[PDB]
Amino acid sequence: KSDFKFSNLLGTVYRQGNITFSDDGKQLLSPVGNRVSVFDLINNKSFTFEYEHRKNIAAIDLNKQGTLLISIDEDGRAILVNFKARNVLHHFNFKEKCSAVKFSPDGRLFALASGRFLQIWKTPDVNKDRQFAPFVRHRVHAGHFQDITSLTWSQDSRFILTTSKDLSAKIWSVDSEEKNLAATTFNGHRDYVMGAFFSHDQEKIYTVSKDGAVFVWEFTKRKYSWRITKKHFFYANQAKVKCVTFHPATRLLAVGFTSGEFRLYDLPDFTLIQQLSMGQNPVNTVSVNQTGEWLAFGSSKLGQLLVYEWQSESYILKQQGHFDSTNSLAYSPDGSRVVTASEDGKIKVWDITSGFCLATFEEHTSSVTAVQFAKRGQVMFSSSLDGTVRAWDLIRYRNFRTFTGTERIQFNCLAVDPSGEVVCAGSLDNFDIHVWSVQTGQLLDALSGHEGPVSCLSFSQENSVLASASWDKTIRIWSIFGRSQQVEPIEVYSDVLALSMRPDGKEVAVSTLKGQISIFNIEDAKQVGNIDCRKDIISGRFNQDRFTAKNSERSKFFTTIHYSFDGMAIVAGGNNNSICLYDVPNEVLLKRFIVSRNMALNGTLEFLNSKKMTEAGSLDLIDDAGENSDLEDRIDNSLPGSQRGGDLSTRKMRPEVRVTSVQFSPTANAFAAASTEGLLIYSTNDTILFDPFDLDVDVTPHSTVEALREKQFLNALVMAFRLNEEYLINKVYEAIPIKEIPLVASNIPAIYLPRILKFIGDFAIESQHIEFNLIWIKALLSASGGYINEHKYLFSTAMRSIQRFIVRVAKEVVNTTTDNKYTYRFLVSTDGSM
Amino acid sequence: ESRKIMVPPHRMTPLRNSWTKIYPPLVEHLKLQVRMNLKTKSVELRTNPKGALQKGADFIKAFTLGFDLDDSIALLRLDDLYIETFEVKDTGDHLSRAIGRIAGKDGKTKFAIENATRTRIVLADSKIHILGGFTHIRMARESVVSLILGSPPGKVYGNLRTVASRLKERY
Amino acid sequence: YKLDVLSSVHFVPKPASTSLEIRVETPTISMEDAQPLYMSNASSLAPQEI
Amino acid sequence: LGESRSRQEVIFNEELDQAISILNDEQLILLMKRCRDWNTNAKTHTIAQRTIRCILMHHNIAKLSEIPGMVKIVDAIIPYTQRHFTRVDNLVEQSYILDYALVEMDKLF
Amino acid sequence: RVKTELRSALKSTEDDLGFNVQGLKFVKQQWNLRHNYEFVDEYDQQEKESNSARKRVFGTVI
Amino acid sequence: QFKTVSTRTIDELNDIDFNTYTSLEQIDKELLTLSIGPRSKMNTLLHLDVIRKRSKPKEAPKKSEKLPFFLQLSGEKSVREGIAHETPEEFKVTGRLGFESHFTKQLREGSQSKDYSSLLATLINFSPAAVDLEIRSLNSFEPFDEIVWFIDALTQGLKSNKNFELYETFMSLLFKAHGDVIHANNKNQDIASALQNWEDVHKKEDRLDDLVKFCMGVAAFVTTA
């Protein structure tokens, strides 16, 4: 139950740093803020590493065995991770801002550009145990005078070619005996040298600078001493070079500028292969595949990530995330994708497994405040600050309905009917609730009676009663349908934000500004029970404020709560960096999750380092923005009293950490939280955590495979259920023959029914045994499908996971074979003559 | 050890005027010795004492077949390049307009199939030679055989669009 | 735009605009983002719109 | 069509579908104009689908394509056939509550 | 008996529904590959299809 | 925490000692079984034209003009594993015996030996662009051998009840690419008999149809009502 682990981070495909591919370039590793996301682009899936830097990460590299990663943040705290085990091996603090880190091609050394020193360390093994100090320093070279901007290893891991802000580039041999082969420095650029690469044969050296010159250096005579043989210029006038890379085997130089334009050249002849634009923001990262066929570009201002094949002029993916600006989320009615309503005015539909956005919708001209699904994933409603609720067909991708009021107000929350005739929406400046029909477009009613801004709306999913709750300390229950026009006001102790509604519509849980979650019986309007949550809330201290995190009143309450689908738990989040989940019978905290440890966000640390507090102000409120290398980030265009507007440049404070929406998954035992870093997805998995169910001493994996070998199949299945071990359940499940699936499925005891149903769901989504899984589903639904119907909310997430398998792989296969049957019948039954 | 490549008397004068750009990669990049028999109208390639004779033979044989100078240098370099020859043979009806169907008005169909399949084609009277990679030759030859054996222009042009995309695509 | 951001986007919306939108017909594969997958393979026009 | 459903390759009586086989371009194009506008119902669609079926299996497909006007008709009533196929497929998939009721009635004893 | 006869009638009507879908889109597709147009370049092809698409104009609210 | 240890007792079913169960490839030969691979490969194959049309940029990139024509072939010396960088191994049809591709050579050899297992292994192996480019070039002109060899290869394939969604999309890609020539020389004996035995094996696929119909209908009834 309560044993959730950080699974995934939807949204935010790129934040800051360098993109890396794999060696067999199937996955790409993308630095999201202080996590690292890895997107597998062929097996369409994605994961995020569990570990967490304390600042935004700035460098990524993993060796070409694929076996370990090293990630450095923006003040040099490196973290070495085992890439296959997904566990962190070492934490190593380099003392200053490291610009690049690279492994050797032969994997055994890595080097990094810390300040103006190139330091080469040698890679610890993945097979060795963790030591106190696994890194053994090879050398540290200091020949540059200003900071080093780039590394490049040679093809043999023998020389390393580094580029600096100082207007040179240098070549260093790895070992001391070849010191005479590599002692030269490469002058001649007017600006920062952005890259320096070898050719395939390591005879030519290309050095690309910030102003736009690429120099070809050759070991020629005018003795032989590395002349410059040709200077080529990009002649991009206002823009200048932001990122350079070179695939030496295909002779492909890829260059991204500060204007979104990137050009890619065939280098020693300098012929423009292609030139096209990501956008208007600068291209912060270019990275290239090992075969040189894919180019991954990252722009850091809009958080966007392309990977683009330049032969077939086509985007493998062109994605863009949302940092800090995400107002709402909603799971699809099968938990396959999450719809995100974001403050720059748009809807984005993110697949969960493959961590990418499928569709985006921009018809709101202001910050979209709420999304909500209806008509079982066919329609989706959203309300924004531009005055409109509007409806979206997720088949034809059309905004087919737009609902406005008559009073020019901005809508902050909505609620749809189950039987989606009526949409409903509430504002924070109008005190009314606006009731629109969906079939016609008209304003059906304006419900009145709150004396405070209607903070939250929800329709009961079963008996269809409306529950609104507002800042006049009052939850209110409206019987709209059928001649009633009945209003029942329940008062409560303080002003309400985030009501939520049970899946059976019996009870309603409200979150209050005191810090509590009260739970009320709807039909008999009396309080069933409350949780007191303001003392298990992690409220950090901001940098600007002059009052401690203990005495602060900023975030000791939950602005979003949500029921579990068995009705037994509540997940909750707010403007604090803890999300908490409880079980509502016992009103006790099951688990509390720290949503960020990034010190680049504001409300993370409860106690701020007193070294940073000086005789006039803290040292993190000092703006060091004019110490910057160029005008576009020396610029301050932040109009003064702006909080929660748009365009993070226009607010002047650090982005605070907050969760704006929490939701449970409708199909598989997880929840998504819309934080500022992205859509944090926390999920359990049954592979770990031995948690048996009434086993005795004679219940053993050995006993289960003896019962399987002796072919008591029902006894082996219930022994594996009492073990609750996923591999054993899978082994017995596949070993039962087709001849006696229905005998076993009829003799399964009723306590092991949700276990076998949720196992069949989470197995059959990705397993290939489609007819076996459908035989088991048919046998279970036929043998025990009355117990399910009279215990709906137990199998409410195990049955939604099963019809996530039938309509999403099995029905697609059945559609293909049906079309083949009918095209056969046409192609042989009719007349093709001339 | 030597090779003889007979230059026909319709590709003789371009060989003589572009000869000064043909023999330098034959005599210093390739280390062959090269003679041009004005009596037999042939090119002789002999090996000196100080497996490239077949490369030089294919170089001058491409020029003999009808491919231009830079195309022949592309065959001389670029190890993954091949060249396939075939007559039509599949007369007013069939011979005199199947080749007009390969060409089109101003050779635009031949230009389109060249750019789509990343080969390049020289079309004689009924002798089609194709210079490209192995898969590229396969697709250009399948489309040429298609529009001498009868296919709609919409079908062959849609196949040309599709083959350009899928030949440039990774995965 | 900057008045809304300065006002910390509590504002009062624009009055009304019954505008006019032309949508061509196309696959909703093509109306999507660039990623390996898709979500729906319908056509953007209804049968009663064709 | 109703008497064809009544009694018993051939979908009408065979003299009627050879009589619909031997009709020319103007007659079959107006026949498919009004099969197009009959197909827009959910009630009158079956008569339209079976007339389209006998035209397709009694005429030449290249001829049907080359008749001028019959590409603005078939574009008009392919997606109606698609929504009727989805509707009848949904109806036959919700038809198996009879089979579930039979297996419950068999587990009764 | 009701189950067998009812499902037989429903599969009998969707058989000819699916037949007509595949036949009519074959007819349209062979007309297209007979005399649609000649663009090998993808950008000119997509602009040609966007100019030759079906347009319908809708009254939206801003 | 970094490797997995064996739960096998010391003193003084290797998958069950390492707490794993590698799921077996198919449980029974009379059971349909999808491919061991991503589920999206069927959809990529079925709609890869419109997906790439989506994926094109909005305007054409600015190239040069003095660009080499054989740029795709003019690499140096991480090796490319596409269908374009394929060399022939080791007297005029569409593919001579020196210039046969691997797919066409294996298709012919399977037509000799009446066992297309290596052909189907190559088909399940390579990528969607390679699959479309191999099916789209299949000698649909004078005697129709390569089409009918592909069709009874798919028959031998989906007799084996494995990878069957891929064999279904390969048949859909065949009918889409050059089903017009099959409709043209309909009533040809070889191609009509190949389609006949393909339908003879393929007509036993409605087990999946009424199985998912039962599961969908009864699951909906049990959940809602």
Coordinates of C-alpha atoms in Angstrom, one line a residue, chain A residues 219-426:
Chain A
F219 CA 50.8 19.9 -39.4
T220 CA 52.5 21.5 -42.4
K221 CA 55.4 23.6 -43.4
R222 CA 55.0 27.2 -44.5
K223 CA 60.0 22.5 -40.5
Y224 CA 56.5 21.3 -39.6
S225 CA 54.7 23.1 -36.8
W226 CA 50.8 23.2 -37.0
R227 CA 50.0 26.0 -39.4
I228 CA 46.5 27.4 -39.8
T229 CA 45.5 26.5 -43.4
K230 CA 41.9 27.9 -43.8
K231 CA 39.6 30.0 -41.7
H232 CA 35.9 29.7 -42.5
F233 CA 33.3 32.0 -41.1
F234 CA 29.6 31.5 -40.4
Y235 CA 28.7 35.2 -41.1
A236 CA 25.7 35.1 -38.8
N237 CA 25.8 38.7 -37.8
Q238 CA 23.8 39.4 -34.7
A239 CA 23.8 35.8 -33.4
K240 CA 26.9 34.0 -32.2
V241 CA 27.9 30.5 -31.5
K242 CA 26.4 28.9 -28.4
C243 CA 27.2 25.2 -28.9
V244 CA 29.5 23.2 -31.2
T245 CA 29.9 19.5 -31.8
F246 CA 31.6 17.4 -34.5
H247 CA 31.1 13.9 -35.6
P248 CA 34.6 13.0 -37.0
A249 CA 33.6 9.9 -38.9
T250 CA 30.9 11.5 -41.0
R251 CA 32.8 14.9 -41.0
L252 CA 29.7 16.6 -39.7
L253 CA 30.0 19.9 -37.7
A254 CA 26.8 20.8 -35.9
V255 CA 26.6 24.4 -34.6
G256 CA 23.8 26.1 -32.7
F257 CA 23.6 29.8 -32.3
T258 CA 22.0 32.2 -29.8
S259 CA 19.1 32.9 -32.2
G260 CA 17.6 29.4 -32.4
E261 CA 19.2 28.8 -35.7
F262 CA 21.5 25.9 -36.1
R263 CA 23.6 25.1 -39.1
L264 CA 25.3 21.8 -39.9
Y265 CA 28.3 21.7 -42.2
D266 CA 30.6 19.1 -43.8
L267 CA 33.6 20.5 -42.3
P268 CA 37.0 20.5 -44.2
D269 CA 35.3 21.8 -47.3
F270 CA 32.8 23.9 -45.2
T271 CA 29.7 23.2 -47.2
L272 CA 26.4 24.0 -45.6
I273 CA 24.5 20.8 -45.4
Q274 CA 21.5 22.3 -43.6
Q275 CA 20.4 25.4 -41.8
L276 CA 17.2 25.6 -39.8
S277 CA 15.8 27.0 -36.6
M278 CA 14.7 25.5 -33.3
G279 CA 12.9 28.7 -32.4
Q280 CA 13.8 32.2 -31.2
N281 CA 15.6 31.2 -27.9
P282 CA 19.3 30.2 -28.0
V283 CA 20.4 26.6 -28.7
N284 CA 22.1 25.6 -25.4
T285 CA 23.2 22.1 -26.3
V286 CA 24.0 20.1 -29.4
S287 CA 24.8 16.4 -29.1
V288 CA 25.3 13.7 -31.8
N289 CA 24.7 10.0 -32.1
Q290 CA 27.6 7.5 -32.3
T291 CA 26.7 6.7 -35.9
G292 CA 26.2 10.5 -36.4
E293 CA 22.6 10.1 -37.7
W294 CA 20.7 11.8 -34.9
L295 CA 21.3 15.3 -33.5
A296 CA 19.8 16.2 -30.2
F297 CA 19.4 20.0 -29.5
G298 CA 18.4 21.5 -26.3
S299 CA 17.2 25.0 -25.7
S300 CA 17.1 25.9 -22.0
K301 CA 14.7 28.9 -21.9
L302 CA 11.6 27.2 -23.0
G303 CA 12.8 23.8 -21.9
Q304 CA 12.8 22.1 -25.3
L305 CA 14.5 19.1 -26.7
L306 CA 14.8 18.1 -30.3
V307 CA 16.4 15.1 -31.8
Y308 CA 16.5 15.4 -35.5
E309 CA 17.9 13.2 -38.2
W310 CA 19.5 15.3 -40.8
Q311 CA 19.6 12.9 -43.7
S312 CA 15.8 12.3 -43.8
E313 CA 15.0 15.9 -42.9
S314 CA 12.7 15.0 -40.0
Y315 CA 12.3 15.3 -36.3
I316 CA 12.5 12.1 -34.3
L317 CA 11.0 14.2 -31.4
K318 CA 10.4 17.9 -30.9
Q319 CA 9.3 18.3 -27.3
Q320 CA 9.0 21.1 -24.9
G321 CA 8.3 21.1 -21.1
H322 CA 7.1 23.6 -18.5
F323 CA 9.3 24.7 -15.7
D324 CA 7.5 26.1 -12.7
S325 CA 4.3 26.9 -14.6
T326 CA 1.9 24.0 -14.2
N327 CA -1.5 24.6 -12.7
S328 CA -3.3 21.3 -12.9
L329 CA -3.1 17.7 -14.0
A330 CA -5.6 15.0 -14.7
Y331 CA -5.1 11.3 -15.3
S332 CA -6.8 9.8 -18.4
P333 CA -9.6 7.5 -17.4
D334 CA -7.2 4.7 -18.0
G335 CA -3.9 5.7 -16.4
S336 CA -2.0 5.8 -19.7
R337 CA -1.5 9.6 -20.0
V338 CA -1.7 12.7 -18.0
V339 CA -3.2 16.0 -19.2
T340 CA -1.3 19.1 -17.9
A341 CA -2.9 22.6 -17.8
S342 CA -0.1 25.1 -17.7
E343 CA 0.3 28.8 -16.9
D344 CA 1.6 29.9 -20.3
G345 CA -1.8 29.1 -21.6
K346 CA -1.8 25.5 -22.9
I347 CA -2.9 21.9 -22.5
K348 CA -0.4 19.2 -23.0
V349 CA -1.1 15.5 -23.1
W350 CA 1.9 13.5 -21.8
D351 CA 2.3 9.8 -22.2
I352 CA 3.4 8.2 -19.0
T353 CA 5.6 5.3 -20.1
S354 CA 7.3 7.0 -22.9
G355 CA 7.9 10.3 -21.2
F356 CA 6.7 12.6 -24.1
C357 CA 3.9 14.8 -25.0
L358 CA 1.4 13.6 -27.6
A359 CA -0.8 16.6 -28.3
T360 CA -0.7 20.2 -27.3
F361 CA -3.6 22.7 -27.3
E362 CA -3.3 26.5 -27.3
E363 CA -6.6 28.2 -27.5
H364 CA -6.7 29.8 -24.1
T365 CA -5.1 33.3 -24.2
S366 CA -4.2 33.1 -20.5
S367 CA -3.2 30.7 -17.7
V368 CA -5.2 27.5 -17.8
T369 CA -6.4 26.8 -14.3
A370 CA -8.2 23.4 -14.4
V371 CA -8.4 20.3 -16.6
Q372 CA -10.9 17.5 -16.1
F373 CA -11.8 14.5 -18.1
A374 CA -15.3 13.3 -19.0
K375 CA -17.3 10.9 -21.2
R376 CA -14.7 8.2 -20.4
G377 CA -11.7 9.8 -22.0
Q378 CA -13.4 11.2 -25.0
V379 CA -13.8 14.8 -23.9
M380 CA -11.7 17.0 -21.7
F381 CA -12.7 20.3 -20.1
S382 CA -10.5 23.2 -19.1
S383 CA -11.0 26.6 -17.5
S384 CA -8.7 29.5 -17.7
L385 CA -8.1 33.1 -16.5
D386 CA -9.1 34.6 -19.8
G387 CA -12.8 34.0 -18.9
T388 CA -13.5 30.8 -20.7
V389 CA -14.3 27.2 -20.0
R390 CA -13.9 25.2 -23.1
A391 CA -14.2 21.6 -24.2
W392 CA -11.8 19.4 -26.2
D393 CA -12.6 16.4 -28.2
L394 CA -9.6 14.0 -27.8
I395 CA -10.4 12.2 -31.1
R396 CA -10.6 15.0 -33.6
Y397 CA -8.5 17.4 -31.5
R398 CA -10.9 20.2 -31.8
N399 CA -12.1 22.8 -29.3
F400 CA -15.8 22.3 -30.0
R401 CA -17.4 24.2 -27.2
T402 CA -16.6 27.4 -25.4
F403 CA -18.6 28.6 -22.4
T404 CA -18.4 32.2 -21.1
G405 CA -20.4 33.9 -18.4
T406 CA -22.1 37.3 -18.7
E407 CA -20.0 39.1 -16.1
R408 CA -16.4 38.9 -17.4
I409 CA -14.8 36.9 -14.6
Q410 CA -11.9 34.5 -14.6
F411 CA -12.4 30.9 -13.7
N412 CA -10.3 29.0 -11.3
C413 CA -11.9 25.6 -10.9
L414 CA -14.4 23.3 -12.7
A415 CA -16.4 20.2 -12.4
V416 CA -18.3 18.1 -14.9
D417 CA -21.2 15.8 -14.7
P418 CA -20.6 12.1 -14.7
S419 CA -23.3 11.9 -17.4
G420 CA -21.6 14.8 -19.1
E421 CA -24.6 17.1 -19.8
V422 CA -23.5 19.9 -17.5
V423 CA -20.2 21.6 -16.8
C424 CA -19.8 23.8 -13.8
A425 CA -17.1 26.3 -12.9
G426 CA -16.2 28.6 -10.1

